[PDB]
Design a protein around this nucleic acid. Structure first.
Ligand SMILES: [Mg+2]
Ligand SMILES: [Mg+2]
Ligand SMILES: [Mg+2]
Ligand SMILES: [Mg+2]
Ligand SMILES: [Mg+2]
Lengths: 126, 210, 156, 60, 78, 97
RNA sequence: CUGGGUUUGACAUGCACAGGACGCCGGCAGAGAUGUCGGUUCCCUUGUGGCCUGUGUGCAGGUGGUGCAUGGCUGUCGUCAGCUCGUGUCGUGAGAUGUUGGGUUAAGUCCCGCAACGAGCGCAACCCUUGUCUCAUGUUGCCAGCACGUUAUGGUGGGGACUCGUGAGAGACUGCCGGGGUCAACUCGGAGGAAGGUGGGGAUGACGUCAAGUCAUCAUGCCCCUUAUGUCCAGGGCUUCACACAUGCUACAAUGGCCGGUACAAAGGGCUGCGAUGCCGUGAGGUGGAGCGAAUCCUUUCAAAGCCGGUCUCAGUUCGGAUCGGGGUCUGCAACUCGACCCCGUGAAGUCGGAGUCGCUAGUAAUCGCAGAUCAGCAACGCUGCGGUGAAUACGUUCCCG
């Protein structure tokens, strides 16, 4: 039983790939019901769209953390990681476009002294 | 003076440990109420003996105190008349027993508070402040376990009403590295014409203490 | 990164329908927060309405109108000698390509009508024909510049 | 930090609203917390000294 | 929603008063409310901070507090 | 059996106190179980508005509170004065259940 | 401050002359202080250890003043790359070398040649959280395969294999190669890879500048008073109105509003508190309380921008809610001069604001979010901590500022 994990800056999802017509068995609903923005639906399939395999393989994912697109990207990286446990032939075709490499950009640090992320109150030139 | 905060409070959560500590559920206020009183009483009485640091823990509401003096023999002259005097005073102040255990530190020259008291006394001794600071530095830096010392005396020195601030350092005294474990001591002396303060820093070595 | 030269450039995707490098940056620009499906669908539907109206490729007409809506100066505010002048700056390729699209997007909402398809389509037709609202609004930006040219030699 | 208030607070009156916080260290009634038990400055001192947990004053 | 503040300081006084059934001025700093009917029949001393103005009491009077009759200021026009 | 779950604040006191407490049972002489920590108590809570015009730096409840759950065996009178004697970190809200 | 107490005191203490009553529980004069009252009428024993009433005594108490006597500390030049010390040499000298000069970098980290040889202070350096893996790994929590399930709850057996869980370790060291590099540093690209060239910014604010806020965090000698400026309380107000101004909500509408319905997560705290099914309401709330020192229960199985439906058709309007009369709710002995809130109604400036000014190159500034303590009570929409969706641009330091 292949089971991998895909996480974003604040999201994390356990994924398992199986052979079957395109379907994402989410926690009580489907892909079209969990991502109606019509942009996350394409972002999640970005790795499986480079080499069309959506209609050929089924995904079973349990996600959490982050928001809608956070979980979208988490499941995206999860598919990217799971695609290696079946056939590494597409590993170069995926790494060329860029996958299995989580964006190092995330939340930075802030605290007292300032009020917002790398932002200071306005000071008038007088 | 800039942001030269006491470095002893920077690594106490990484390398060094805390001086006083206890647990109190809805009783921290009443506990500190007596802790500050005991601190004032000791600063008044035992300061003549050369107290360095008073660790005040808390057992099941009775007592837990530890002191590290510098002149063993003056605070305890005759068992009962001087050693038990502070115990009786504390028992009269706070309605709790006191099993005071007076132990001696490994050496006085290695402590920051003790050298601070020594410099404060040498300043009032009418001797040249520069030579006093030099002698204190030399005595404290006789490689017992130390590797750097820094003393800064400020106030109305020189028997006048001016405001000078000398500076002296030996060896390495880095303040931007956690692997320092510097000891700091605070105190203020009063002369016949004003107040004087002394900031002391003692860097021993780069002990990670993992 | 800022004020230290151009940062590493990011690539841009292209659409395989028409095959143009100026039909996807506009999409990415109009992809406002939370609005990515309706606006894209309206733009896709209007891309064919424009082809049917002008009887020309949906991209050649826009490429040609980019020059018709190309200004020559931009009004600014430069204070010197106790006076604030409207000293403009010469146009550049990228700066003009960005300003034209910015003005087009800003004026596509000028018409307070409800029909967004019309708001987006009928403007491109008039712009290509020489009567677009953007073409008309671009007149004052150059008129004020020519008027203030009396003190527009400081190169700033 | 009035010697009258520092005693009235810890006193045991016959009313509810007659009780205050009145930090015992100095007597500053502003910002005196419950778990910490000190005013703003009285707590920030030991915080920068690392005596208590949950202290990270980063970002300038 | 006829349960507003009870004004215990005046309730106890009017109770000890009706225990003897007298009509006298209740000398107290009661400027809060007279909601309960137990306050009817008796007179009290309004404490607005400056002075007091006596008034007569009856049964058909329900709806305000004890101090909102005349404000701390006076309205005369000139 | 008596269970003990100590908490912590600055990501280190948890183990700094576990490796000191859970070893007192061994110092006294008895068997003990390995470590089994729980993440935290999170408890979403969000009802407040903001200026709504300069409203950015979107962030929510950055904090971590670890828990170290381990059991103890052979409870004796001398095994209860191990933690109450001193609580060095000031952040371990230990609870013996 | 308007008026009234105590005026050796409201809050501590060393000695005199005197006591077992002080201390407490209730009413009373009451605006309260405070006084008169009722009850208790000492714990030890002859000497007083603890108690205080007043009586004499030095004293408590100064929030009485100065950050120009000080100790001690936000914010700034600045996270800017520089500042000093030992010896030597040189000039009668203030003093110079080191630290001028070449490169890369944010940098004085490096070296080169030079009367220089070394070092400190910052940087450098270490590391928390974050970015990926392995070892350790099952509760109050997840669930593959087995069962129980029926819809508010893996709630209940089993699997540590899955991540969340977090002690250690591998892992990003210009480490290797290709071209440029005195063949010296260093740099562009290529690689595994989660991170590659101080990943991310941080605690770190350096010798010092501005006698930089603060004698109101606290200590402090001099100056001034103590039947008072100490101290108690009933009440007044520091929020009064048409204003010069400010980090700056609500809005000005089709990238907007209204209602009925509607999914995720990131994810603090609870012992005199959060507080559910259901009954009470159109709403602030009320009788009640399973659960609770808590991965459980509680802010509910736990929002919205956005998302699929009905509509206003570009306007001082059904957006906008200030103010006002009235039901009032709320916590408070107290909501009246004076807090927060729903609702019935009256329904204001304002149609994206001129000269000007200000934040912002990567999850940064906007477009929907958060609050605990500071409170018994709320201005809390400004703060100390802080999740999510997600674009725009880049010729260079000529130009304003440092
Ligand atoms: Mg001044
Ligand atoms: Mg010479
Ligand atoms: Mg008063
Ligand atoms: Mg004020
Ligand atoms: Mg209060």
């Amino acid at each position: 039983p292949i089971q991998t994990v895909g996480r974003r800056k604040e999201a994390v999802v356990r994924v398992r790939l199986v052979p079957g017509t395109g379907q994402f068995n989410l926690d009580g609903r489907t892909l079209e019901n969990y991502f109606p923005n019509k942009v996350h639906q394409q972002l999640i399939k970005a790795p499986l769209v480079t080499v069309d395999r959506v209609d050929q393989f089924d995904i079973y994912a349990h996600l959490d953390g982050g928001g809608p697109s956070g979980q979208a990207g988490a499941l995206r990286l999860a598919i990217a990681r799971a695609l290696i446990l079946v056939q590494p032939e597409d590993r170069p075709a995926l790494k060329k476009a860029g996958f299995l490499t989580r964006d190092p950009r995330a939340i930075e640090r802030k605290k007292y002294g300032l009020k917002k992320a790398r932002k200071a109150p306005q000071y008038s030139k007088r | 003076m800039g942001q030269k905060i006491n470095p002893h409070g920077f690594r106490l959560g990484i390398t060094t440990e805390w001086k006083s500590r206890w647990y109190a559920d809805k009783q921290y206020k009443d506990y500190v109420k007596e802790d500050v009183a005991i601190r004032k009483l000791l600063a008044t009485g035992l300061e003549r003996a050369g107290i360095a640091d008073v660790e005040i823990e808390r057992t099941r509401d009775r007592v837990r105190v530890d002191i590290h003096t510098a002149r063993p023999g003056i605070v305890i002259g005759r068992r009962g008349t001087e050693a038990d005097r502070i115990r009786a005073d504390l028992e009269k102040l706070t309605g709790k027993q006191v099993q005071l255990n007076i132990l001696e530190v490994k050496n006085p020259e290695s402590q920051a508070q003790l050298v601070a008291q020594g410099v404060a006394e040498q300043l009032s001794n009418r001797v040249a402040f520069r030579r006093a600071m030099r002698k204190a530095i030399q005595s404290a830096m006789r490689q017992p376990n130390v590797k750097g010392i820094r003393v800064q005396c400020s106030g109305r020195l020189g028997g006048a009403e001016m405001s000078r601030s000398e500076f002296y350092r030996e060896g390495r005294v880095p303040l931007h590295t956690l692997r320092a474990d510097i000891d700091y001591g605070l105190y203020e002396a009063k002369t016949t014409f004003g107040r004087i303060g002394v900031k002391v820093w003692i860097y021993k070595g780069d002990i990670v203490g993992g | 990164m800022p004020r230290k030269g151009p940062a590493p450039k990011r690539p841009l995707v292209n659409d395989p329908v028409y095959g143009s490098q100026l039909v996807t940056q506009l999409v990415n620009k109009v992809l406002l927060e939370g609005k990515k499906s309706l606006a894209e669908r309206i733009v896709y539907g209007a891309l064919e309405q424009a082809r049917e109206k002008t009887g020309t490729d949906p991209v050649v007409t826009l490429k040609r109108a980019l020059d018709n809506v190309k200004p020559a100066l931009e009004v600014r505010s430069r204070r010197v000698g106790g006076a604030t002048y409207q000293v403009p700056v010469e146009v550049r390729p990228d700066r003009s390509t960005t300003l034209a699209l910015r003005w087009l997007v800003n004026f596509s909402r000028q018409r307070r009508e409800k029909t967004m398809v019309e708001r987006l389509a009928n403007e491109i037709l008039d712009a290509s024909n020489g009567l677009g609202a953007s073409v008309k609004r671009r007149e004052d930006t150059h008129k004020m510049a020519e008027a203030n040219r009396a003190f527009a030699h400081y190169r700033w | 930090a009035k010697k009258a208030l520092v005693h009235k607070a810890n006193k045991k009156p016959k009313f509810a609203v007659r009780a205050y916080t009145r930090c015992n260290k100095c007597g500053r009634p502003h910002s005196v917390y419950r778990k910490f038990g000190l005013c703003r400055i009285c707590l920030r001192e030991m915080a920068h000294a690392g005596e208590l947990p949950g202290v990270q004053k980063s970002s300038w | 929603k006829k349960g507003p503040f009870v004004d215990d300081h005046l309730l106890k006084k009017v109770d000890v008063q009706n225990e003897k059934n007298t009509k006298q001025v209740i000398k107290t700093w009661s400027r809060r409310s007279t909601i309960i009917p137990d306050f009817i029949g008796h007179t009290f001393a309004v404490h607005d901070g400056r002075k007091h103005v006596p008034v007569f009491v009856t049964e058909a009077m329900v709806g305000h507090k004890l101090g909102e009759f005349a404000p701390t200021r006076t309205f005369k026009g000139h | 059996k008596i269970r003990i779950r100590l908490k912590a604040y600055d990501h280190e006191a948890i183990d700094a106190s576990a490796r000191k407490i859970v070893e007192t049972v061994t110092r006294t002489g008895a068997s003990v179980v390995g470590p089994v920590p729980l993440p935290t108590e999170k408890n979403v809570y969000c009802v407040i508005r903001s200026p709504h015009k300069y409203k950015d730096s979107r962030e929510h409840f950055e904090m971590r509170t670890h828990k170290r759950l381990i059991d103890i065996l052979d409870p004796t009178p001398k095994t209860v004065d191990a933690l109450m004697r001193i609580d060095l970190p000031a952040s371990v809200d230990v609870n013996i259940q």
